[PDB]
Amino acid sequence: KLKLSNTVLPSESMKVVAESMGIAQIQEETCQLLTDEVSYRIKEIAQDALKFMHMGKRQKLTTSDIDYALKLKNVEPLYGFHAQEFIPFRFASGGGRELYFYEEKEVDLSDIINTPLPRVPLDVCLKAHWLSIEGCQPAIPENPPRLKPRSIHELSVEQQLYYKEITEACVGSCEAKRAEALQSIATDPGLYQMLPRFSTFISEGVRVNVVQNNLALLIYLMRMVKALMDNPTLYLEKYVHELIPAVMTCIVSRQLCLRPDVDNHWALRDFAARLVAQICKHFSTTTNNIQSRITKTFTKSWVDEKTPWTTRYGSIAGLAELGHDVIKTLILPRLQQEGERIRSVLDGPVLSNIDRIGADHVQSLLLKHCAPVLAKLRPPPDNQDAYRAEFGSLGPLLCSQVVKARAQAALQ
Amino acid sequence: DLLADENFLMVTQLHWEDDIIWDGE
Amino acid sequence: NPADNYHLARRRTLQVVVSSLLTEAGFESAEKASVETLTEMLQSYISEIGRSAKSYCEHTARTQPTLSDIVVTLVEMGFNVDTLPAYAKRSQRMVITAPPVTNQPVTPKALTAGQNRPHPPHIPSHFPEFPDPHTYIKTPTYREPVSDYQVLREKAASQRRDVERALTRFMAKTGETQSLFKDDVSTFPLIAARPFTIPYLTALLPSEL
């Protein structure tokens, strides 16, 4: 079965061209005579431009194929103009005209000068790799993808040794070892079918690593989670039910080790955990299961009375990094409670506990989020004392942060 | 549509919130 | 993006050159189709002194063109070359800086690895090394076997003792029981002695034979 037809250009476009040139009162047989001649020349060239596509080993007819197909038929590749003498440009392609259907048809002559020129890409280089090693294709990134018998483990001993080396490097005794092992996790194509043992090693580790709050052990495991996520080959949402309660525990947990000093890292432990938490709510998303579940746990962590302030700071960070609208709709009705908590830490003399440090970190983070939440939905008018209607927390310093954001927008 | 593979992935079928360790001891 | 950029960087510089010459003339704000027309005549003009001055030098058995090959190339395009020293010394002229190059950031990171299996003698040393000792090859492993006579004797002994203790406690709990101590059924329960009607049959006869 082949219902191949012969499609020509419409004749009602050929009369428009003729009467816009000075040739009026053309017959229909005169006009049909134009549109079978030019529709043959388009068919003659597109069949001849397909020879250059095949010879150049491409599957896409580029714009230069018609320039050589025209030159082959002794017609000048010039499209915009036609030179009768032909001596200024002799069969020289000018690359066509960059024109559109939805164009503006008028530009300002200094708009084209002030725009930055595009980057000239890298020159052609010759890299070698291996498609086949004695018959087997390697999984390198240059490649696409009655007694019952004694059973064998589903991992090879080179794979099991690889797992042992990667896990003993990812506990961060040496930093270069970690970084390679993290890149190895980030781009090994054959790291599926080992992924249950990695997920179990992560999950089990954090739970027996928060019994004593060992921050490095945790910072290395969170970097291992981040290296597991950006690998494009492996299928992760079968294992995310073990991954997510591990990161929530890094963010919402108390620190058994020295309260101050590494709290700076603790904020980053909660910074790395809140980053990977909102990356996990960005991926793996179905209706009303993952993002809303962690949002509900974060909100009941917040509205809980008389929290641990480490848990409070971590949950505050976690709800803070959830995007544009989430702070637009959630952090709004709660400023008074935040201020009251800050006032209590301030009044009670107790300084040797971690409450004061937790309070300062929470207030700074909340104030930065409130700044753009404001820069985003209102003009920057009355930035001096109008914020005193919102208990006067960040006030003029919040206004200065909004001004810095406006300066960054101007730079953009 | 309730036989879709996702319904059976254990993120959508497990109360994994209970695992998060809060103030453990 | 990059393949478009390869052609576009060199076309967009040509368009900026055209816009600058138009501004020098007196035009501010030109029509859009009139700019892509004039920058198409500009690219076709550089490509025509490229093809014709190469043809005039290679006709004279040379490979790179001198000045005498371009002043005959421009004559054959009707240029009147003598007016060009006056055009170059304008006071109104601009300078469009060349398109930015990604070659300056040519190489972010280069490194080597070890544990790659050796090359077979039909592959010389200058070909790339064989990858990880796990990328392409696999061999099976087994579970750790406990062939130790001490722990096997201990396992068989403790399992026999535990099953006979479980059996005797179950049979003493579900029947008549005696006790060495007063009211002692939980600890040391004795199965009660029942008399047989013919006791030599259960005494003298072997049971495993």
Q: What distance in Å separates the CA atoms of residue A242 and residue A236, rounded to the nearest whole number?
A: 10
Closest by alpha carbon to A49, among A63, A33, A28, A30? A63
Classified as helix, coil or strand, C14 is helix
- C141: nearest CB among A105, A113, A152: A152
Chain A residues with beta carbon closer than 8 angstroms to that of B14? 241
CB crowding A229-260: b at 16 or more within 10 Å, else e: bebeebebbbbbbbbbbbbbbbbbbbbeeebe
* Residue A353 CB neighbour total at 10 angstroms: 13
Q: What distance in Å separates the CA atoms of residue A342 and residue A391, rounded to the nearest whole number?
A: 12
Residue type, C167: L
Tokens of A178: 């970690």
Tell me the count of A-C CB pairs closer than 8 A: 179
List the single residue in A with minimal CA-CA distance to B6: A286
Inspect the interface and report whether the beta carbons of A308 and B20 lie closer than 8 Å. Answer: no
Inspect the interface and report whether the beta carbons of A289 and B11 lie closer than 8 Å. Answer: yes
Residue type, C184: D
Q: Chain A closest CA to C71's CA: distance in Å?
A: 14
Expressed in Å, this structure's resolution amounts to: 6.8
Q: What distance in Å separates the CA atoms of residue A401 and residue A399, rounded to the nearest whole number?
A: 5
Contact (CB, 8 A) for A185 and A231: yes
Q: Do chains C and A touch (3 or more CB pairs under 8 A)?
A: yes
Looking up residue A27, the CATH number of its domain turns out to be: 1.10.20.10
Please report which residue ranges of A238-388 form alpha helices under DSSP H: 240-252, 263-282, 291-302, 309-320, 324-329, 335-347, 355-376
Sorted by sequence, the CB contacts under 8 Å of residue A117 that are 6+ apart come out as C9, C12, C13, C16, C99, C100
Tokens of A29: 């047989």
Inspect the interface and report whether the beta carbons of A210 and B24 lie closer than 8 Å. Answer: yes
Radius of gyration of chain C (CA): 50
Contact (CB, 8 A) for C54 and C73: no
Q: What distance in Å separates the CA atoms of residue A308 and residue A255, rounded to the nearest whole number?
A: 10
Give A137's Cβ-side CA count (13 Å radius). 9
Closest by alpha carbon to A304, among B19, B22, B21? B22
Contact (CB, 8 A) for A376 and A369: no
**Does A370 contact B at CB distance below 8 Å?**
no
Chain C residues with beta carbon closer than 8 angstroms to that of A97? 33, 36-37, 40
**Range C72-77, long-range pairs (CB < 8 A, 24+ positions):** C73/C49, C74/C49, C76/A87, C76/C52, C77/A87, C77/A88, C77/C48, C77/C49, C77/C52
Torsion angle defined by CA atoms of residues B6, B9, B10 and B13, in that order, rounded to the nearest 10 degrees: 30
CB crowding C126-158: b at 16 or more within 10 Å, else e: eeeebbbebbbbeeeeeeeeeeeeeeeeeeeee
- Domain holding A34, by residue range, is 11-73
Chain C residues with beta carbon closer than 8 angstroms to that of A123? 103
Q: Chain C closest CA to A100's CA: distance in Å?
A: 10
Inspect the interface and report whether the beta carbons of C52 and A190 lie closer than 8 Å. Answer: no
Experiment type: cryo-EM
**Beta pairing partners, C178:** C190
**Beta pairing partners, C101:** A120
